[PDB]
């Protein structure tokens, strides 16, 4: 009987950990989308990694509590391999995955 | 605080830790958060943590992997440190370890450390030494440079290189491939018995060297061959690091009179110089033979001289002694008293779910294809136990290793890492194995948790309540330890004993009639002093006598020879019941279809106290018998179960079930014609009735219920 | 020792016997002890090595030797009296032996006692709880808990104040006291050396503790007291005493209080004679385990020697239907021979029992055997109610208890189940004493609570049973 919310954190490839406030039955939809308007650019396409070695999909209306992400959980950070080709390719070093307006306020872990 | 004591792991993989959630709130970590270890001689590593609800709050869980990169064991204490400043990694160069690369080529990157990292993110620091397993070997490796240092995580985008010949390993560190505890599949019950006996004076001496009072001085571990006795004793002194010597009794009894003895007193010197330390002696039956079945000098005087060497244990402190033998009456009885070897631990044979458990350990380094069932292997191979099934792994793997090599005609001292990688085991390569296979233990009973649930039996619904009460009552708040049955034969008295059983997960013990003659006919009764023991060594197990009366049938049963009531082998029952206490987690189940000629002693006071009479089902349980028949199969909605039940008024439960299998096999055999219908039809329950009878009759009945009204 | 000198060479294992034979002679006066006596001299007929006889031919003429080797006494020591070869048993050499045997509840105190003389104890620490809980235990598994539970005691708390070494402060070790925490602890980790063996003693069962047989109570005492404490009027009258009575009757009724209690008013053994070892005998093709018993007897006088179960015997040979034959047999022979041999002088009374009198072999009721009958029917109004009472004496019990109205409803329950009844009214008064803490006396609703699953263990049939056949003896 324990637990109804999760917290969950993402590990960004530039070094930042991403913090946000869930429900123990909120969809993979609704992260994804929590992660976009939290990105430098919400239309560059992503995936989130489990802690389990699974993958989450976007497109797939499962629960954080059917996921293994209750009642909390650190989630990978990857851009998905089209345009990770296309950024590399350009000598293009992706040094900044979120927006400003959420680094201005960084906190440091304790 | 922030410390907890080093167990075992549940998953295996090697780069994850398992701690209880209530201390991940406490270190603010989430799950797949990434933490330091802190071991002894200032050593670290870097995992991930998850949980579990298994994980004891003052605990964490590693596998052998994670205890030897920190140098500790079972029963350490580490430290936790969250370490997020970890990032991912550029460059990582793995090197692989001499010991496990000898006889093996090729690019292992390519098998072993690309797969195994990609998309993985594991934690890894410099120094660290892993298992990648497959290609039917067990290789393990030490990365030797990082660029980020001392740790980091794997990326997809991290250069893994491998250039350099075998690092050699240090003397401090074992190999990953030597037997531990998760090399033991079933029998983990009798494994647990030996940790509390074994691991406490190994892992803290000073407890029992600051006392007068000695631990157990040796264990016999009995059994069939191939079951793990020399596995356990290996493994635990592995995992405690106790020096383990091997003796055996040919290797003693080879040599001759003065040779054979000095040998034998030599390595009990040799164990206290390297205490702690246990002492394994194999085929003690061999090397310590009852002295009446021999006139020889050597064989009595070598009994003689291990006798004094168990009793000099008291001095030679911190050195247990453990035996194997296959019987525990084998042995000269002089071993077994008081000290010596006065404590046993009976293996067994492991059943479907260890069986299981034993061919994923061997298939660890196997590749099998999507069309293996291990579980269904597991499921057929009864009466095998461990020895037998590492060699049925060994023939899948060699059957198809012919299959292809026949076509890759690779000839040189090594083989190739690529051609192994593709090497897969099918199930047909497990099916001809299979039968090639032949067990070594079906001739010993194997006992084994039931798989009849309440769900199979019908009717008798206050029967069923009576026996959850009998064994719920002593655990929730002298309290009966046995029950005899009565009635008609074919009413499901075996299965309320069976299905008790199941649903306790408590393992069953059958005895029937041609067990309890065979006692009886070859003047062995005594055998049933084994079974009582067994039903200690089984607990919490049923220990069910089914057709107490066969033996008085045989002498006669209606007329009589020599002998009556009473037999040799009841007598014994009667005698070892008197020595089972009710907290030995032993339920006895007695059943007979006369319970007037049964000797009445088994009803008295402290024995089969609780006493049920099992009636013919009536009509709604009839119903529900030929539901619970039919469950396992399809049945066309025109079958009407209720006027098959309205009929069969005087049937048994036995004789519903005859005609459930007549009008299934009505049903196969005119698919089959078609072919040449794919449900059970009304037409055959209505032809299997025209030859169904009933198997008891009245007469018999009013024989049950006087006989119930006698005694009330 | 046996193992240590059988592990010698032939010639080394001979020489070593009589070097301390030799040894004691020179250091005489002197005590040769040899232990596992049934190692270093099994019986012969029983080996086929010749080192085993001839060590046994040694030691044989080595004891005959202390005739000549003055102020030498040899002792030894056995698991069994009759594991040893008999040679060394016949006059002079081991001429003399004792039964040690099982430490008794009382022993079992002395022996806490005893290895806790240095122990501060505190004064939760009750021993004699212990001792009464130590079933199957010996001297050698009470000390292990004696000194385990000083060891809990000195981890939990001396362990935290002092060093690693061999040296601690008096004042550190006399503030060390050992809790009742620290013995339960020690008693769950220890396991009894000796719990099947059979356990000889002087019973604690008094006449106050048995209900109702006012009249067996004093025929007892007539039967084992009289013929010591008159016997100027039996040998007036020409009297020949009985050697034994049999009881017969329901299972239930106080039959091992009355045996027990007779034992303890004469401060004599009581040996328990069960079922199981008369059919382990006759199965086991070992009938001279009967010598045994009644040796016991002879050698525990003053002892009362209750055979139990003496229809164990005929039921072997089918009790009910068996041959065509009688009850006779090889064990029911020795054993009415033994009987035959026995004086009454040597302070041994022999008891007999059985809950099916009708297939008892009719020697065992000859004159010079069991010939006197008693029959112990369920207890009747009065009885029940005494037997109520008597349980209920160590417990305070609430006047709203009617234990005549609980005794009217028991017609059929024997004393062993209006026990339970006790037992378990009591268990649910200590329930309740329990919660109120989380009362002080029973109360009826414990009692009429207990009803509910008490049942009687006598049917009416089997009382029909046993009452027609003491009316057939008239
Ligand atoms: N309970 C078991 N669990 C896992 N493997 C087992 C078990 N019992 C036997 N084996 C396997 O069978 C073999 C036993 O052979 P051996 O080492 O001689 O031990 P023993 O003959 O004492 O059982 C080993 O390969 C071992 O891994
Ligand atoms: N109450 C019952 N419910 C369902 N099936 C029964 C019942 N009684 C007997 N049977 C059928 O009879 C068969 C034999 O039952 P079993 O308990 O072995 O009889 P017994 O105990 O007399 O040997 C079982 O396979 C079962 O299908
Ligand atoms: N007349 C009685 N008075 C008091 N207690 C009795 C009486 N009869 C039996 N009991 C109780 O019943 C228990 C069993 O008695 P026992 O004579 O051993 O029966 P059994 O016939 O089984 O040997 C005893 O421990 C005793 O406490």
Same mark, same amino acid.
């Given at each position: 009987?324990?637990?109804?919310?999760?917290?969950?954190?993402?590990?960004?490839?530039?070094?930042?950990?991403?913090?946000?406030?869930?429900?123990?039955?909120?969809?993979?939809?609704?992260?994804?989308?929590?992660?976009?308007?939290?990105?430098?650019?919400?239309?560059?396409?992503?995936?989130?990694?489990?802690?389990?070695?699974?993958?989450?999909?976007?497109?797939?209306?499962?629960?954080?509590?059917?996921?293994?992400?209750?009642?909390?959980?650190?989630?990978?950070?990857?851009?998905?391999?089209?345009?990770?080709?296309?950024?590399?390719?350009?000598?293009?070093?992706?040094?900044?995955?979120?927006?400003?307006?959420?680094?201005?306020?960084?906190?440091?872990?304790? | 605080?922030?410390?907890?004591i080093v167990d075992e792991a549940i998953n295996e993989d090697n780069?994850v830790v398992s701690?209880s959630?209530?201390?991940?709130?406490?270190?603010?970590?989430?799950?797949?958060?990434?933490?330091?270890?802190?071991?002894?001689?200032?050593?670290?590593?870097?995992?991930?943590?998850?949980?579990d609800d298994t994980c004891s709050d003052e605990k964490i869980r590693m596998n052998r992997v994670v205890r030897?990169?920190?140098?500790?064991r079972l029963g350490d204490?580490?430290?936790?440190?969250?370490?997020?400043?970890?990032?991912?990694?550029?460059?990582?160069?793995?090197?692989?370890?001499?010991?496990?690369?000898?006889?093996?080529?090729?690019?292992?990157?390519?098998?072993?450390?690309?797969?195994?990292?990609?998309?993985?993110?594991?934690?890894?620091?410099?120094?660290?030494?892993?298992?990648?397993?497959?290609?039917?070997?067990?290789?393990?490796?030490?990365?030797?440079?990082?660029?980020?240092?001392?740790?980091?995580?794997?990326?997809?985008?991290?250069?893994?290189?491998?250039?350099?010949?075998?690092?050699?390993?240090?003397?401090?560190?074992?190999?990953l491939n030597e037997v531990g505890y998760d090399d033991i599949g079933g029998c983990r019950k009798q494994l647990a018995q030996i940790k509390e006996m074994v691991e406490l004076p190994l892992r803290?001496?000073?407890?029992?060297?600051?006392?007068?009072?000695?631990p157990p001085?040796?264990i016999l571990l009995y059994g069939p061959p191939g079951t793990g006795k020399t596995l356990i004793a290996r493994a635990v002194a592995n995992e405690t690091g106790a020096?383990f010597?091997?003796?055996?009794?040919?290797?003693?009894?080879?040599?001759?009179?003065?040779?054979?003895?000095?040998?034998?007193?030599?390595?009990?010197?040799?164990?206290?110089?390297?205490?702690?330390?246990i002492?394994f002696?194999d085929?003690?039956?061999?090397?310590?033979?009852?002295?009446?079945?021999?006139?020889?000098?050597?064989?009595?005087?070598?009994?003689?001289?291990?006798?004094?060497?168990?009793?000099?244990?008291?001095?030679?402190?911190?050195?247990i002694?453990m035996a194997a033998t296959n019987?525990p009456?084998?042995?000269?009885?002089?071993?077994?008293?008081?000290?010596?070897?006065?404590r046993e631990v009976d293996i067994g044979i492991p059943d479907a779910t260890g069986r299981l458990e034993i061919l994923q350990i061997h298939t660890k380094?196997?590749?099998?294809?999507?069309?293996?069932?291990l579980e269904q292997v597991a499921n057929?191979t009864h009466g095998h136990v461990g020895a037998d099934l590492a060699?049925l792994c060994?023939?899948?793997?060699?059957?198809?290793?012919?299959?292809?090599?026949?076509?890759?005609?690779?000839?040189?001292?090594?083989?190739?890492?690529?051609?192994?990688?593709?090497?897969?085991?099918?199930?047909?390569?497990?099916?001809?194995?299979?039968?090639?296979?032949?067990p070594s233990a079906?001739?010993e009973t194997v006992v084994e948790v039931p798989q009849?649930?309440?769900?199979?039996?019908?009717?008798?619904?206050?029967?069923?309540?009576?026996?959850?009460?009998?064994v719920?009552?002593?655990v929730?708040?002298?309290?009966?330890?046995?029950?005899?049955?009565?009635?008609?034969?074919?009413?499901?008295?075996?299965?309320?004993?069976?299905?008790?059983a199941n649903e306790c997960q408590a393992n069953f013990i059958?005895?029937?009639?041609?067990? %309890?003659?065979? $006692?009886?006919? =070859?003047? @062995?009764? *005594?055998?049933?002093? !084994? +079974?009582?023991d067994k039903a200690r060594q089984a607990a919490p197990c049923v220990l069910?006598?089914?057709?107490?009366?066969?033996?008085?049938?045989?002498?006669?049963?209606?007329?009589?020879?020599?002998?009556?009531?009473?037999?040799?082998?009841?007598?014994?029952?009667?005698?070892?019941?008197?020595?089972?206490?009710?907290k030995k987690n032993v339920f006895?189940?007695?059943?007979?279809?006369?319970?007037?000629?049964?000797?009445?002693?088994?009803?008295?006071?402290?024995?089969?106290?609780?006493?049920?009479?099992?009636?013919?089902?009536?009509?709604?349980?009839?119903?529900?018998?030929?539901?619970?028949?039919?469950?396992?199969?399809?049945?066309?909605?025109?079958?009407?179960?209720?006027? %098959?039940?309205? $009929?069969?008024? =005087?049937? @048994?439960? *036995?004789?519903?079930? !005859? +005609?459930?299998?007549?009008?299934?096999?009505?049903?196969?055999?005119?698919?089959?014609?078609?072919?040449?219908?794919?449900?059970?039809?009304?037409?055959?329950?209505?032809?299997?009735?025209?030859?169904?009878?009933?198997?008891?009759?009245?007469?018999?009945?009013?024989?049950?219920?006087?006989?119930?009204?006698?005694?009330? | 020792?046996?193992?240590?000198?059988?592990?010698?060479?032939?010639?080394?294992?001979?020489?070593?016997?009589?070097?301390?034979?030799?040894?004691?002679?020179?250091?005489?006066?002197?005590?040769?002890?040899?232990?596992?006596?049934?190692?270093?001299?099994?019986?012969?007929?029983?080996?086929?090595?010749?080192?085993?006889?001839?060590?046994?031919?040694?030691?044989?003429?080595?004891?005959?030797?202390?005739?000549?080797?003055?102020?030498?006494?040899?002792?030894?020591?056995?698991?069994?009296?009759?594991?040893?070869?008999?040679?060394?048993?016949?006059?002079?050499?081991?001429?003399?032996?004792?039964?040690?045997?099982?430490?008794?509840?009382?022993?079992?105190?002395?022996?806490?006692?005893?290895?806790?003389?240095?122990?501060?104890?505190?004064?939760?620490?009750?021993?004699?709880?212990?001792?009464?809980?130590?079933?199957?235990?010996?001297?050698?598994?009470?000390?292990?808990?004696?000194?385990?539970?000083?060891?809990?005691?000195?981890?939990?708390?001396?362990?935290?104040?002092?060093?690693?070494?061999?040296?601690?402060?008096?004042?550190?070790?006399?503030?060390?006291?050992?809790?009742?925490?620290?013995?339960?602890?020690?008693?769950?980790?220890?396991?009894?050396?000796?719990?099947?063996?059979?356990?000889?003693?002087?019973?604690?069962?008094?006449?106050?503790?048995?209900?109702?047989?006012?009249?067996?109570?004093?025929?007892?005492?007539?039967?084992?007291?009289?013929?010591?404490?008159?016997?100027?009027?039996?040998?007036?009258?020409?009297?020949?005493?009985?050697?034994?009575?049999?009881?017969?009757?329901?299972?239930?009724?106080?039959?091992?209080?009355?045996?027990?209690?007779?034992?303890?008013?004469?401060?004599?053994?009581?040996?328990?004679?069960?079922?199981?070892?008369?059919?382990?005998?006759?199965?086991?093709?070992?009938?001279?385990?009967?010598?045994?018993?009644?040796?016991?007897?002879?050698?525990?006088?003053?002892?009362?020697?209750?055979?139990?179960?003496?229809?164990?015997?005929?039921?072997?040979?089918?009790?009910?239907?068996?041959?065509?034959?009688?009850?006779?047999?090889?064990?029911?022979?020795?054993?009415?021979?033994?009987?035959?041999?026995?004086?009454?002088?040597?302070?041994?009374?022999?008891?007999?029992?059985?809950?099916?009198?009708?297939?008892?072999?009719?020697?065992?009721?000859?004159?010079?055997?069991?010939?006197?009958?008693?029959?112990?029917?369920?207890?009747?109004?009065?009885?029940?109610?005494?037997?109520?009472?008597?349980?209920?004496?160590?417990?305070?019990?609430?006047?709203?208890?009617?234990?005549?109205?609980?005794?009217?409803?028991?017609?059929?329950?024997?004393?062993?189940?209006?026990?339970?009844?006790?037992?378990?009214?009591?268990?649910?008064?200590?329930?309740?004493?329990?919660?109120?803490?989380?009362?002080?006396?029973?109360?009826?609703?414990?009692?009429?609570?207990?009803?509910?699953?008490?049942?009687?263990?006598?049917?009416?049939?089997?009382?029909?049973?046993?009452?027609?056949?003491?009316?057939?003896?008239?």
């Amino acid at each position: 009987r324990k637990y109804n919310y999760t917290l969950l954190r993402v590990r960004l490839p530039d070094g930042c950990l991403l913090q946000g406030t869930f429900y123990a039955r909120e969809r993979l939809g609704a992260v994804y989308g929590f992660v976009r308007e939290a990105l430098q650019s919400d239309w560059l396409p992503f995936e989130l990694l489990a802690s389990g070695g699974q993958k989450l999909s976007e497109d797939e209306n499962l629960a954080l509590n059917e996921c293994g992400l209750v009642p909390s959980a650190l989630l990978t950070f990857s851009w998905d391999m089209a345009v990770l080709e296309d950024i590399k390719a350009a000598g293009a070093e992706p040094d900044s995955i979120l927006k400003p307006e959420l680094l201005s306020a960084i906190e440091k872990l304790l | 605080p922030n410390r907890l004591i080093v167990d075992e792991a549940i998953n295996e993989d090697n780069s994850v830790v398992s701690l209880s959630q209530p201390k991940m709130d406490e270190l603010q970590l989430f799950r797949g958060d990434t933490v330091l270890l802190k071991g002894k001689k200032r050593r670290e590593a870097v995992c991930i943590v998850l949980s579990d609800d298994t994980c004891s709050d003052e605990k964490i869980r590693m596998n052998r992997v994670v205890r030897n990169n920190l140098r500790v064991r079972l029963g350490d204490v580490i430290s936790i440190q969250p370490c997020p400043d970890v990032k991912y990694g550029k460059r990582i160069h793995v090197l692989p370890i001499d010991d496990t690369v000898e006889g093996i080529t090729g690019n292992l990157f390519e098998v072993y450390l690309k797969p195994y990292f990609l998309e993985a993110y594991r934690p890894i620091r410099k120094g660290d030494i892993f298992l990648v397993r497959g290609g039917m070997r067990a290789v393990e490796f030490k990365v030797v440079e990082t660029d980020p240092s001392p740790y980091c995580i794997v990326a997809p985008d991290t250069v893994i290189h491998c250039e350099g010949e075998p690092i050699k390993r240090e003397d401090e560190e074992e190999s990953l491939n030597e037997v531990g505890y998760d090399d033991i599949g079933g029998c983990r019950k009798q494994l647990a018995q030996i940790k509390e006996m074994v691991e406490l004076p190994l892992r803290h001496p000073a407890l029992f060297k600051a006392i007068g009072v000695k631990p157990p001085r040796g264990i016999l571990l009995y059994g069939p061959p191939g079951t793990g006795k020399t596995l356990i004793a290996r493994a635990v002194a592995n995992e405690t690091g106790a020096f383990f010597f091997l003796i055996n009794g040919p290797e003693i009894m080879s040599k001759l009179a003065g040779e054979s003895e000095s040998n034998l007193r030599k390595a009990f010197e040799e164990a206290e110089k390297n205490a702690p330390a246990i002492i394994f002696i194999d085929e003690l039956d061999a090397i310590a033979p009852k002295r009446e079945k021999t006139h020889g000098e050597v064989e009595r005087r070598i009994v003689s001289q291990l006798l004094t060497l168990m009793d000099g244990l008291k001095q030679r402190a911190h050195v247990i002694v453990m035996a194997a033998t296959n019987r525990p009456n084998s042995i000269d009885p002089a071993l077994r008293r008081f000290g010596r070897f006065d404590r046993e631990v009976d293996i067994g044979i492991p059943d479907a779910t260890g069986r299981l458990e034993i061919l994923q350990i061997h298939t660890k380094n196997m590749k099998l294809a999507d069309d293996v069932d291990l579980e269904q292997v597991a499921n057929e191979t009864h009466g095998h136990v461990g020895a037998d099934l590492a060699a049925l792994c060994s023939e899948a793997a060699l059957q198809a290793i012919r299959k292809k090599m026949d076509l890759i005609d690779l000839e040189d001292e090594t083989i190739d890492a690529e051609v192994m990688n593709s090497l897969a085991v099918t199930m047909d390569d497990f099916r001809w194995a299979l039968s090639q296979s032949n067990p070594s233990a079906l001739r010993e009973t194997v006992v084994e948790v039931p798989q009849v649930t309440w769900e199979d039996i019908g009717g008798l619904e206050d029967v069923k309540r009576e026996l959850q009460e009998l064994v719920q009552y002593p655990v929730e708040h002298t309290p009966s330890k046995g029950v005899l049955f009565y009635g008609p034969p074919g009413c499901g008295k075996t299965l309320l004993a069976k299905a008790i059983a199941n649903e306790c997960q408590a393992n069953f013990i059958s005895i029937k009639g041609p067990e %309890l003659l065979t $006692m009886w006919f =070859g003047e @062995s009764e *005594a055998n049933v002093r !084994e +079974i009582f023991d067994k039903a200690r060594q089984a607990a919490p197990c049923v220990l069910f006598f089914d057709e107490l009366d066969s033996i008085a049938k045989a002498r006669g049963g209606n007329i009589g020879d020599g002998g009556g009531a009473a037999d040799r082998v009841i007598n014994q029952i009667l005698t070892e019941m008197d020595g089972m206490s009710t907290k030995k987690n032993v339920f006895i189940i007695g059943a007979t279809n006369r319970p007037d000629i049964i000797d009445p002693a088994i009803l008295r006071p402290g024995r089969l106290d609780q006493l049920i009479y099992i009636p013919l089902p009536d009509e709604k349980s009839r119903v529900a018998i030929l539901k619970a028949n039919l469950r396992k199969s399809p049945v066309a909605k025109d079958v009407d179960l209720e006027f %098959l039940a309205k $009929m069969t008024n =005087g049937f @048994s439960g *036995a004789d519903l079930t !005859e +005609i459930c299998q007549r009008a299934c096999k009505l049903a196969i055999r005119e698919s089959i014609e078609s072919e040449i219908v794919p449900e059970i039809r009304r037409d055959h329950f209505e032809e299997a009735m025209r030859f169904a009878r009933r198997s008891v009759s009245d007469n018999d009945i009013r024989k049950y219920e006087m006989f119930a009204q006698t005694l009330q | 020792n046996g193992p240590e000198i059988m592990s010698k060479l032939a010639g080394e294992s001979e020489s070593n016997l009589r070097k301390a034979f030799e040894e004691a002679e020179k250091n005489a006066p002197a005590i040769i002890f040899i232990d596992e006596l049934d190692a270093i001299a099994p019986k012969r007929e029983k080996t086929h090595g010749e080192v085993e006889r001839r060590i046994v031919s040694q030691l044989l003429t080595l004891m005959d030797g202390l005739k000549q080797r003055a102020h030498v006494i040899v002792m030894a020591a056995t698991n069994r009296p009759n594991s040893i070869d008999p040679a060394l048993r016949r006059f002079g050499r081991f001429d003399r032996e004792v039964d040690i045997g099982i430490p008794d509840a009382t022993g079992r105190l002395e022996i806490l006692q005893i290895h806790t003389k240095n122990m501060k104890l505190a004064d939760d620490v009750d021993l004699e709880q212990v001792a009464n809980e130590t079933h199957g235990h010996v001297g050698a598994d009470l000390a292990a808990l004696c000194s385990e539970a000083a060891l809990q005691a000195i981890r939990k708390k001396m362990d935290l104040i002092d060093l690693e070494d061999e040296t601690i402060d008096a004042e550190v070790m006399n503030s060390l006291a050992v809790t009742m925490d620290d013995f339960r602890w020690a008693l769950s980790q220890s396991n009894p050396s000796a719990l099947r063996e059979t356990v000889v003693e002087v019973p604690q069962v008094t006449w106050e503790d048995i209900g109702g047989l006012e009249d067996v109570k004093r025929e007892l005492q007539e039967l084992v007291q009289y013929p010591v404490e008159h016997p100027d009027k039996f040998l007036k009258f020409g009297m020949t005493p009985s050697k034994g009575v049999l009881f017969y009757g329901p299972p239930g009724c106080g039959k091992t209080l009355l045996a027990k209690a007779i034992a303890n008013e004469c401060q004599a053994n009581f040996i328990s004679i069960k079922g199981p070892e008369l059919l382990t005998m006759w199965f086991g093709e070992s009938e001279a385990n009967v010598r045994e018993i009644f040796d016991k007897a002879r050698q525990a006088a003053p002892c009362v020697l209750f055979f139990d179960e003496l229809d164990s015997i005929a039921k072997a040979r089918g009790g009910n239907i068996g041959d065509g034959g009688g009850a006779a047999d090889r064990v029911i022979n020795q054993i009415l021979t033994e009987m035959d041999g026995m004086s009454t002088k040597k302070n041994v009374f022999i008891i007999g029992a059985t809950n099916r009198p009708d297939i008892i072999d009719p020697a065992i009721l000859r004159p010079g055997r069991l010939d006197q009958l008693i029959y112990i029917p369920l207890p009747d109004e009065k009885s029940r109610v005494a037997i109520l009472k008597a349980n209920l004496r160590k417990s305070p019990v609430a006047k709203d208890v009617d234990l005549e109205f609980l005794a009217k409803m028991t017609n059929g329950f024997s004393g062993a189940d209006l026990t339970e009844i006790c037992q378990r009214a009591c268990k649910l008064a200590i329930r309740e004493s329990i919660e109120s803490e989380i009362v002080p006396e029973i109360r009826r609703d414990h009692f009429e609570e207990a009803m509910r699953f008490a049942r009687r263990s006598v049917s009416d049939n089997d009382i029909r049973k046993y009452e027609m056949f003491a009316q057939t003896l008239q």
